[PDB]
Design a protein around this motif. Structure first.
Motif, short mmCIF file in Angstrom:
data_model
loop_
_atom_site.label_atom_id
_atom_site.label_comp_id
_atom_site.label_asym_id
_atom_site.label_seq_id
_atom_site.Cartn_x
_atom_site.Cartn_y
_atom_site.Cartn_z
N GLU A 84 -15.23 26.11 96.51
CA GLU A 84 -14.67 25.49 95.35
C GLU A 84 -15.32 26.41 94.05
OE1 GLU A 84 -14.71 20.60 93.75
OE2 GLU A 84 -16.46 21.66 94.99
N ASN A 85 -14.60 26.24 93.03
CA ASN A 85 -15.16 27.06 91.61
C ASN A 85 -15.51 28.28 91.75
OD1 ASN A 85 -16.29 23.68 91.04
ND2 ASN A 85 -14.23 24.47 90.21
N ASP A 86 -14.57 29.05 92.60
CA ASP A 86 -14.98 30.37 93.18
C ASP A 86 -14.63 31.61 92.00
OD1 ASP A 86 -15.89 32.44 94.74
OD2 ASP A 86 -13.84 32.63 96.18
N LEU A 87 -15.68 31.53 91.04
CA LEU A 87 -15.49 32.39 89.90
C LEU A 87 -16.87 33.03 89.46
CD1 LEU A 87 -12.54 30.77 87.75
CD2 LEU A 87 -12.42 32.77 89.19
N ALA A 88 -17.12 34.10 88.99
CA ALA A 88 -18.22 34.57 88.59
C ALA A 88 -17.74 35.68 87.17
CB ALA A 88 -19.27 35.28 89.42
N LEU A 89 -18.71 35.51 86.11
CA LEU A 89 -18.67 36.55 85.14
C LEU A 89 -19.53 37.37 85.14
CD1 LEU A 89 -17.35 33.92 82.44
CD2 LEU A 89 -16.34 36.16 83.14
N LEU A 90 -19.38 38.67 85.27
CA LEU A 90 -20.55 39.74 85.26
C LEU A 90 -20.47 40.62 83.85
CD1 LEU A 90 -19.50 41.39 88.89
CD2 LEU A 90 -21.23 39.38 88.25
N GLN A 91 -21.65 40.49 83.37
CA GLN A 91 -21.64 41.28 81.95
C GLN A 91 -22.08 42.88 82.35
OE1 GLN A 91 -24.58 40.12 78.94
NE2 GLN A 91 -23.05 40.43 77.57
N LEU A 92 -21.11 43.73 81.70
CA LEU A 92 -21.50 45.28 81.71
C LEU A 92 -22.80 45.43 81.09
CD1 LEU A 92 -17.80 46.11 81.19
CD2 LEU A 92 -18.81 45.98 83.42
N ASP A 93 -23.58 46.39 81.16
CA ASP A 93 -24.57 46.89 80.66
C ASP A 93 -24.15 47.87 79.41
OD1 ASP A 93 -24.44 49.33 82.14
OD2 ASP A 93 -26.54 49.84 82.07
N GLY A 94 -22.96 47.87 78.98
CA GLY A 94 -22.24 48.74 78.06
C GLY A 94 -21.08 47.88 77.35
N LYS A 95 -20.47 48.59 76.74
CA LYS A 95 -18.92 48.04 75.90
C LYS A 95 -18.04 49.12 76.00
CE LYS A 95 -17.48 46.14 71.55
NZ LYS A 95 -17.81 46.21 70.25
N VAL A 96 -16.95 48.59 76.95
CA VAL A 96 -15.59 49.30 76.87
C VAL A 96 -14.81 49.48 75.56
CG1 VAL A 96 -13.28 49.36 78.20
CG2 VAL A 96 -15.65 48.50 79.40
N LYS A 97 -14.55 50.71 75.29
CA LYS A 97 -13.84 51.04 74.29
C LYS A 97 -12.29 51.19 75.01
CE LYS A 97 -12.19 54.30 70.63
NZ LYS A 97 -11.99 55.71 70.30
N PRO A 98 -11.36 50.31 74.71
CA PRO A 98 -10.28 50.56 75.43
C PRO A 98 -9.40 51.84 75.22
CG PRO A 98 -10.21 48.54 74.03
CD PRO A 98 -11.13 49.22 73.67
N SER A 99 -9.00 52.43 76.62
CA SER A 99 -8.36 53.76 76.59
C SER A 99 -7.06 53.50 77.65
CB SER A 99 -9.13 54.88 77.22
OG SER A 99 -9.68 54.42 78.42
N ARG A 100 -6.46 54.65 77.74
CA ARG A 100 -5.10 54.62 78.66
C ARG A 100 -5.61 54.03 79.94
NH1 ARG A 100 -3.11 57.97 82.39
NH2 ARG A 100 -4.99 59.22 82.35
N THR A 101 -6.71 54.48 80.51
CA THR A 101 -7.39 54.07 81.73
C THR A 101 -8.20 52.62 81.98
OG1 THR A 101 -9.05 55.53 82.01
CG2 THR A 101 -6.97 56.38 82.42
N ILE A 102 -8.67 52.45 80.91
CA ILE A 102 -9.55 51.17 80.77
C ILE A 102 -9.24 50.20 79.71
CG2 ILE A 102 -11.85 50.30 80.96
CD1 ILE A 102 -12.92 53.25 81.94
N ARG A 103 -8.71 49.17 79.90
CA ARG A 103 -8.19 48.11 79.03
C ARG A 103 -8.37 46.73 79.48
NH1 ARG A 103 -5.90 48.62 74.06
NH2 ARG A 103 -5.56 50.75 74.60
N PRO A 104 -9.24 45.73 78.73
CA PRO A 104 -9.33 44.32 79.22
C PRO A 104 -7.65 43.49 79.47
CG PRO A 104 -10.83 44.75 77.68
CD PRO A 104 -9.84 45.90 77.52
N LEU A 105 -7.68 42.53 80.20
CA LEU A 105 -6.44 41.98 80.43
C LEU A 105 -6.64 40.51 79.56
CD1 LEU A 105 -3.62 41.42 81.60
CD2 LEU A 105 -4.82 40.83 83.75
#
Length: 231
Positions: A84-105
């Motif tokens: 039940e409630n099978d979700l976790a949030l993982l915080q990166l030790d950095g910050k993504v600047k969106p690009s062609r290959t990496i972008r949040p949804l």
């Protein structure tokens, strides 16, 4: 994924690979420049040796690697045999600047309903055959949402799926997410909108009496916003 298709490379730039010692364990979705959402059951692990790898198509390729600053399991997560409630949030030790290959949804609205019959897809690097090996390349599978009540039938999930679960079906009996695919995103509709996070895969991946299940994201949006600090 069993019976899936290789994706066009970098076509799903929100995809994360959660790895231990360079070995892929679970999928994940980048939902904030600093945060990946995945399944809680993916974190039954020695946290120090875990990494998040972004921008991948081929798994034996470096991508962009992050250490994990924090691993925040849903406060009401319960494991197998009462998942039940099978979700976790993982915080990166950095910050993504969106690009062609990496972008949040983008998160969905907290009012989003994932109705039966909705057409969706998932993506992952999980097993391509029962007892097999991980996919070398990111693959996808089309899935339609099933009626939860029918999925709760005594011959299927036997009443165990709550209103927060999304029950799913591939187009044939021999296509299914499989070990390594869990924690990855379910995206639905023409808009490919984030709708769920794949929960634990059945040990026998193509078990016809255990339709794959994902946790709906919408009921968890307020918690995700409180944790990430973004209203």
């Amino acid at each position: 994924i069993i019976g899936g298709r290789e994706v066009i490379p970098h076509s799903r730039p929100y995809m994360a690979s959660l790895q231990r010692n360079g070995s892929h364990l679970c999928g994940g979705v980048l939902v904030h420049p600093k945060w990946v959402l995945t399944a809680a059951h993916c974190l039954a692990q020695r946290m120090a040796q875990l990494r998040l790898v972004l921008g991948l198509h081929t798994l034996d390729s470096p991508g962009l690697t992050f250490h994990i600053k924090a691993a925040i399991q849903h406060p009401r997560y319960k494991p197998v045999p009462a998942l039940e409630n099978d979700l976790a949030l993982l915080q990166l030790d950095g910050k993504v600047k969106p690009s062609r290959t990496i972008r949040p949804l983008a998160l969905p609205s907290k009012r989003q309903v994932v109705a039966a019959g909705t057409r969706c897809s998932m993506a992952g690097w999980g097993l391509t055959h029962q007892g097999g090996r991980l996919s070398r390349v990111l693959r996808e599978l089309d899935l339609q949402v099933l009626d939860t009540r029918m999925c709760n039938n005594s011959r299927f999930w036997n009443g165990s799926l709550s209103p927060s679960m999304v029950c799913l079906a591939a187009d044939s009996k021999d296509q299914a997410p499989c070990k390594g695919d869990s924690g990855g995103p379910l995206v639905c509709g023409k808009g490919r909108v984030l709708a769920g996070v794949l929960s634990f895969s059945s040990r026998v991946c193509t078990d016809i009496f255990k339709p794959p299940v994902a946790t709906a994201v919408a009921p968890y949006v307020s918690w995700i916003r409180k944790v990430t600090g973004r209203s």
